[PDB]
Amino acid sequence: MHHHHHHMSTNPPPPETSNPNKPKRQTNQLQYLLRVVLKTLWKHQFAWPFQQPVDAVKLNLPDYYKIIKTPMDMGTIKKRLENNYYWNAQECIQDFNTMFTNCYIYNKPGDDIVLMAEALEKLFLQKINELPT
């Protein structure tokens, strides 16, 4: 008997950051989402949990990907913006929304990580209220 000792927890593959068959565009709004919105959130005190795909193995969260089925993070968003992956600003905004919502689903009000997400979401909303064009 192996007693399943070899069945260790793993992370899923990360979201794609390039897809040659997906239509994309460089718009002023998308350039702004990278240069201003993402880059200022990236420098924030609370950016660190969100700068890369959730590493459920490192964080000892083996239930994370049992609960969260559409993972998203600012590292993925940053690469998508730099690689010119998006067609429009709303597609990128959707990824930010998924990132924040995933955090609120997996965690509970009052958790340190939720307070971090709440603060970043407030800055995000402030920065995207007005976009170029």
Q: Site residues (CB under 5 A) for Na ion? A: 30, 57, 60, 84, 86, 127, 130
Q: Residue 44 has which token pair? A: 């924030």
Q: Of 57 and 67, which has the nearer Cβ to Na ion?
A: 57
Nearest approach in angstroms of CB 97 to Na ion is: 16
Nearest approach in angstroms of CB 111 to Na ion is: 19
Nearest approach in angstroms of CB 32 to Na ion is: 7
Q: What residue number has its CB nearest to Na ion?
A: 86
Read out DSSP for 37-77? IIHHHHTSTT-GGGSS---TTTTT-TTHHHH-SS---HHHH
Q: Residue 36 has which token pair? A: 């201003």
Nearest approach in angstroms of CB 109 to Na ion is: 26
Q: Of 84 and 97, which has the nearer Cβ to Na ion?
A: 84
| CA-based torsion, 120, 81, 89, 93: positive or negative | negative
Q: Of 31 and 104, which has the nearer Cβ to Na ion?
A: 31
Q: Of 64 and 86, which has the nearer Cβ to Na ion?
A: 86
On whether the CB atoms of residues 81 and 38 are closer than 8 A, the answer is: yes
Give the integer Cα–Cα distance in Å for 16 and 76: 8
